[PDB]
Amino acid sequence: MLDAFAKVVAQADARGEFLTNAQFDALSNLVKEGNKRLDAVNRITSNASTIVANAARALFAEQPQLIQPGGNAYTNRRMAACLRDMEIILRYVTYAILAGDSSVLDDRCLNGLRETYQALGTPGSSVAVAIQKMKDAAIAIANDPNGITPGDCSALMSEIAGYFDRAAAAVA
Amino acid sequence: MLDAFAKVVAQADARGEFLTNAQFDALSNLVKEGNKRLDAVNRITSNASTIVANAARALFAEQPQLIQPGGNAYTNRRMAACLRDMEIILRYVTYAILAGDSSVLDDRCLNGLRETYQALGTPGSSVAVAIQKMKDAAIAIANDPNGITPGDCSALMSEIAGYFDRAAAAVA
Amino acid sequence: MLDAFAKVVAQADARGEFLTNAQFDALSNLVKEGNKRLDAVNRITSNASTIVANAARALFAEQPQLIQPGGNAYTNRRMAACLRDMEIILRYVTYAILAGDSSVLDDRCLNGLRETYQALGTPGSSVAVAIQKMKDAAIAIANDPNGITPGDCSALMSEIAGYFDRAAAAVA
Amino acid sequence: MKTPITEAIAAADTQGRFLSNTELQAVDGRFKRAVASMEAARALTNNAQSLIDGAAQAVYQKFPYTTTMQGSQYASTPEGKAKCARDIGYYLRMITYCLVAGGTGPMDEYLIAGLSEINSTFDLSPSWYIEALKYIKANHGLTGQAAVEANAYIDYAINALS
Amino acid sequence: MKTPITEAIAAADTQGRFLSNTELQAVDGRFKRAVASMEAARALTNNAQSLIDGAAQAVYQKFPYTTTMQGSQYASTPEGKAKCARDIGYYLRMITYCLVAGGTGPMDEYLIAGLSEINSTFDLSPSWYIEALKYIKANHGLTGQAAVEANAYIDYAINALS
Amino acid sequence: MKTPITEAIAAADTQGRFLSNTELQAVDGRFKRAVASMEAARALTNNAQSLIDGAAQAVYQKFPYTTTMQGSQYASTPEGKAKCARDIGYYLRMITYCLVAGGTGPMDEYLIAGLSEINSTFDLSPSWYIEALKYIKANHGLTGQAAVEANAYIDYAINALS
Ligand SMILES: *[C@@H](C)[C@H]1/C(=C/c2[nH]c(/C=C3N=C(/C=C4\NC(=O)C(CC)=C4C)C(C)=C\3CCC(=O)O)c(CCC(=O)O)c2C)NC(=O)[C@@H]1C
Ligand SMILES: *[C@@H](C)[C@H]1/C(=C/c2[nH]c(/C=C3N=C(/C=C4\NC(=O)C(CC)=C4C)C(C)=C\3CCC(=O)O)c(CCC(=O)O)c2C)NC(=O)[C@@H]1C
Ligand SMILES: *[C@@H](C)[C@H]1/C(=C/c2[nH]c(/C=C3N=C(/C=C4\NC(=O)C(CC)=C4C)C(C)=C\3CCC(=O)O)c(CCC(=O)O)c2C)NC(=O)[C@@H]1C
Ligand SMILES: *[C@H](C)[C@H]1/C(=C/c2[nH]c(/C=C3N=C(/C=C4\NC(=O)C(CC)=C4C)C(C)=C\3CCC(=O)O)c(CCC(=O)O)c2C)NC(=O)[C@@H]1C
Ligand SMILES: *[C@H](C)[C@H]1/C(=C/c2[nH]c(/C=C3N=C(/C=C4\NC(=O)C(CC)=C4C)C(C)=C\3CCC(=O)O)c(CCC(=O)O)c2C)NC(=O)[C@@H]1C
Ligand SMILES: *[C@H](C)[C@H]1/C(=C/c2[nH]c(/C=C3N=C(/C=C4\NC(=O)C(CC)=C4C)C(C)=C\3CCC(=O)O)c(CCC(=O)O)c2C)NC(=O)[C@@H]1C
Ligand SMILES: *[C@H](C)[C@H]1/C(=C/c2[nH]c(/C=C3N=C(/C=C4\NC(=O)C(CC)=C4C)C(C)=C\3CCC(=O)O)c(CCC(=O)O)c2C)NC(=O)[C@@H]1C
Ligand SMILES: *[C@H](C)[C@H]1/C(=C/c2[nH]c(/C=C3N=C(/C=C4\NC(=O)C(CC)=C4C)C(C)=C\3CCC(=O)O)c(CCC(=O)O)c2C)NC(=O)[C@@H]1C
Ligand SMILES: *[C@H](C)[C@H]1/C(=C/c2[nH]c(/C=C3N=C(/C=C4\NC(=O)C(CC)=C4C)C(C)=C\3CCC(=O)O)c(CCC(=O)O)c2C)NC(=O)[C@@H]1C
HEC readout, chain C: CCCHHHHHHHHHHHHCCCCCHHHHHHHHHHHHCHHHHHHHHHHHHCCHHHHHHHHHHHHHHHCHHHCCCCCCCCCHHHHHHHHHHHHHHHHHHHHHHHHCCCHHHHHHHHCCHHHHHHHHCCCHHHHHHHHHHHHHHHHHHHCCCCCCCCCCCHHHHHHHHHHHHHHHHHHC
CATH T-level topology, domain A1-172: Globin-like (1.10.490)
Contacts 24+ apart (CB under 8 A), B56-59: B56/B82, B56/B83, B56/B86, B56/B130, B56/E121, B57/E72, B57/E122, B58/B133, B59/B126, B59/B129, B59/B130, B59/B133
Relative orientation angle of helices B34-45 and B48-62, to the nearest 10 degrees: 60
* Nearest one of F121, F137, F120, F111 to F54, comparing CA atoms: F137
b/e map D93-117, b = 16+ CB within 10 Å: bbbbbbbbbbbbbbbbbbbbbbbeb
Q: Is D20 in the pocket of ligand 2 (CB under 6 A)?
A: no
D47 CB burial (10 A radius; 0-12, 13-18, 19+): middle
* Nearest one of B11, B19, B13, B23 to D45, comparing CA atoms: B19
Handedness of CA B150, B156, B162, B167 (dihedral sign): negative
Nearest protein Cα to ligand 3, atom 21: C38
b/e map B81-113, b = 16+ CB within 10 Å: bbbebbbebbbbbbbbbbbbbbbbbbeebbeeb
Q: Is C147 in the pocket of ligand 3 (CB under 6 A)?
A: no
Distance CA A159, CA A9 (A): 21
Measure D113 CA to ligand 7 centroid, in angstroms: 15
Secondary element (H or E) of residue A35: helix A34-45
**Is F161 part of the contact surface with chain C (CB cutoff 8 Å)?**
no
Answer whether C102's CB lies under 8 Å from C166's CB. Answer: yes
DSSP A47-101: THHHHHHHHHHHHHHH-GGGTSTTSTT-SHHHHHHHHHHHHHHHHHHHHHHHHTS
Answer whether E87's CB lies under 8 Å from B19's CB. Answer: no
D25 to chain A, closest Cα gap in Å: 33
Report the structure determination method: X-ray
Measure B38 CA to ligand 2 centroid, in angstroms: 7
Distance CA B133, CA B131 (A): 5
Secondary element (H or E) of residue B104: helix B103-105
Distance CA F77, CA F53 (A): 16
Query: F41 and A13: CB-CB below 8 Å?
Result: no
Measure A40 CA to ligand 4 centroid, in angstroms: 27
Residues of C whose CB is below 8 A from F110: 75-77
Relative orientation angle of helices E21-46 and E48-62, to the nearest 10 degrees: 80
Which residues have a Cβ under 8 Å from the Cβ of D31 and sit 6 or more positions away? B31, B34
Q: Rounded to whole angstroms, what are the CA distances from E65 to B57, B68, E59, E85? A: 22, 28, 10, 17
Considering only CB atoms, F97 lies closest to which of A13, A24, A38, namely: A13
**Is C18 part of the contact surface with chain B (CB cutoff 8 Å)?**
no
| Sequence letter at residue F16 | G
Query: C15 and B68: CB-CB below 8 Å?
Result: no
Q: Which residue of B has its CA nearest to A70?
A: B14
F76 CB burial (10 A radius; 0-12, 13-18, 19+): middle
**Three-state DSSP class for residue D60:** helix
Nearest protein Cα to ligand 1, atom 16: F28
Q: Is C127 in the pocket of ligand 6 (CB under 6 A)?
A: yes
Query: D115 and A81: CB-CB below 8 Å?
Result: no
Which of A82, A87, A93, A164 is the pocket-test mutation for ligand 4 (most atoms within 8 Å of CB)?
A82
Q: Which residue of A has its CA nearest to D123?
A: A53
To test the contact with chain C by mutation, choose from E13, E18, E45 the residue with the greatest count of C C-beta atoms within 10 A, namely: E18
Query: A77 and D72: CB-CB below 8 Å?
Result: no
Measure A126 CA to ligand 4 centroid, in angstroms: 12
Pocket of ligand 9 (CB under 6 A): C 57, 60, 67, 74-76, 79; F 59, 66, 72-75, 80, 83-84, 87-88, 90, 110-111, 118, 122, 124, 128-129, 132
Measure B62 CA to ligand 8 centroid, in angstroms: 16
**Is F77 part of the contact surface with chain C (CB cutoff 8 Å)?**
no
Q: CB count, 10 Å around CB of A151? A: 11
Distance CA D55, CA D85 (A): 9
- Specify the ligand 6 atom closest to the Cα of C92: 20
Q: How far apart are the first and last CA of chain A?
A: 24
- Specify the ligand 9 atom closest to the Cα of C57: 36
Answer whether D113's CB lies under 8 Å from A77's CB. Answer: yes
Answer whether B103's CB lies under 8 Å from B10's CB. Answer: no
Q: What is the signed CA dihedral for B29, B30, B34, B39, rounded to 10 degrees?
A: 120
* Nearest one of B16, F134, D139 to A71, comparing CA atoms: B16
**Is B16 part of the contact surface with chain A (CB cutoff 8 Å)?**
yes
Query: E110 and B76: CB-CB below 8 Å?
Result: yes
CATH code for residues F1-162: 1.10.490.20
Answer whether B98's CB lies under 8 Å from D27's CB. Answer: yes
Residues of B whose CB is below 8 A from A70: 14-16
Answer whether D100's CB lies under 8 Å from B27's CB. Answer: yes
- Specify the ligand 9 atom closest to the Cα of F76: 41
Answer whether A44's CB lies under 8 Å from A97's CB. Answer: yes
| Secondary structure letter of residue B108 according to DSSP | I
Q: Which residue of A has its CA nearest to C72?
A: A14
Which residues have a Cβ under 8 Å from the Cβ of D151 and sit 6 or more positions away? D137
Q: Is B85 in the pocket of ligand 2 (CB under 6 A)?
A: no
* Nearest one of A99, F97, F100, F102 to F112, comparing CA atoms: F97
List the alpha helices (DSSP H) in D15-143: 21-46, 48-62, 78-101, 105-107, 115-121, 126-139
b/e map C5-27, b = 16+ CB within 10 Å: bbbbbbebbeeeebbeeebbeeb
Which residues have a Cβ under 8 Å from the Cβ of A172 and sit 6 or more positions away? A124, A125, A127, A128
Measure B35 CA to ligand 2 centroid, in angstroms: 4
Answer whether E113's CB lies under 8 Å from E2's CB. Answer: no
List the alpha helices (DSSP H) in E47-143: 48-62, 78-101, 105-107, 115-121, 126-139
CA C104 to chain centre: 11
Distance CA C107, CA D66 (A): 70
Q: What is the signed CA dihedral for B129, B134, B135, B139, rounded to 10 degrees?
A: 160
Measure C149 CA to ligand 3 centroid, in angstroms: 6
Residues of B whose CB is below 8 A from A76: none
CA A65 to chain centre: 26
> Which numbered ligand comes closest to the C-alpha of A116?
4
Q: Is A149 in the pocket of ligand 1 (CB under 6 A)?
A: yes
Answer whether C83's CB lies under 8 Å from F117's CB. Answer: yes
- Specify the ligand 7 atom closest to the Cα of A73: 17
Q: Rounded to whole angstroms, what are the CA distances from D65 to D58, D61, D87, D128, E22? A: 13, 9, 18, 11, 85
Distance CA B33, CA B98 (A): 12
| Secondary structure letter of residue B110 according to DSSP | I
Q: CB count, 10 Å around CB of A11? A: 12
Domain ranges of chain E: 1-162
